[PDB]
Paper text:
The interaction energy between the flipping helix and the inner helices in the short state was tuned by combining hydrogen bond layers (“A”) or hydrophobic layers (“X”) in different orders in each of three possible positions. Designs were given three-letter names corresponding to the layers in order, starting at the hinge proximal position. Structure prediction calculations (Rosetta symmetric fold-and-dock) suggested that some layer combinations (such as XAX) would be more favorable for the short state than others (such as AAA) and that the short and long backbones states would be among the lowest-energy states of these systems. SEC-MALS measurements indicated that, in solution, XAX, XAA, and AAA were trimeric as expected; CD wavelength and temperature measurements for XAX, XAA, and AAA showed that the designs were helical and highly temperature stable.
We used de novo protein design to generate very closely related proteins that adopt two very different states—a short state and a long state, like a viral fusion protein—and then created a single molecule that can be found in both forms. Inspired by class I viral fusion proteins, such as influenza hemagglutinin, we chose homotrimeric helical bundles as the fundamental architecture. We decided on a design scheme with two divergent conformations containing a constant six-helix bundle “base” and a variable portion with three inner helices and three “flipping” helices.
Author numbering:
A (entry chain A), B (entry chain B), C (entry chain C): 4 to 92
């Protein structure tokens, strides 16, 4: 992500020269720079997307823990029902 | 992400010709391609931001399961006290 | 991500003038606009990446709750074993 910020910084420096003394080779130089920055942006998006797979894994885990807690909650309610009935005995 | 990867590869080819034999219409053609690629980048960021709403949902669900586990742990300790107290009688 | 969508829309509007009557100052105008759009894209990616730290925090919390649910299940099983022993004897 720091690569991105630097890439953009180089791009602003090229644009700085271009706007002062315009030139065709500087226009092309600018476009090449833009492409390189775009290629890094795509790499970063690619990494964000692969990383975001964890959101799904966290989802499944939360859902599993929901179920486990439900089972334990029922077992404790059956245990409390066992004591209340046994204590009377 | 493949769509994004492809519009970048096209953009490399346009840039390829541009540097081989520079021209105005090629410069414009390149700028048009950059706009198209940026539009795809923006859609991808939009989808990433949309998709990332699930992180908020996960955190809330985690917080709720924390409360349930807190209640279940409290009752098990309340039950343990009951059993130990019963053993006396 | 509305700033992005507007920036891209401005960029498409400069691109219409460019393809209408090509010109050097318009080519530069377009490149400056592209740089600004990329700058916003980078900011957006930056924010997505910082936000995504919460995925790590959620993962840890889920792991913590897995351990607690495991201990609660063990304690409840040992309690069920105790009552069955007391009820018998
Ligand atoms: Br998450
Ligand atoms: Br959880």
């Amino acid at each position: 992500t720091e690569d991105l910020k630097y890439s953009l910084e180089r791009l602003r420096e090229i644009l700085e020269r271009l706007e002062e003394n315009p030139s065709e080779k500087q226009i092309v130089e600018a476009i090449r720079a833009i492409v390189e920055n775009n290629a890094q942006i795509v790499e970063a998006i690619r990494a964000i997307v692969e990383n975001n797979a964890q959101i799904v894994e966290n989802n499944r885990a939360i859902i599993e823990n929901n179920e486990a807690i439900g089972g334990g909650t029922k077992q404790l309610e059956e245990m409390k029902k066992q004591l209340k009935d046994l204590k009377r005995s």
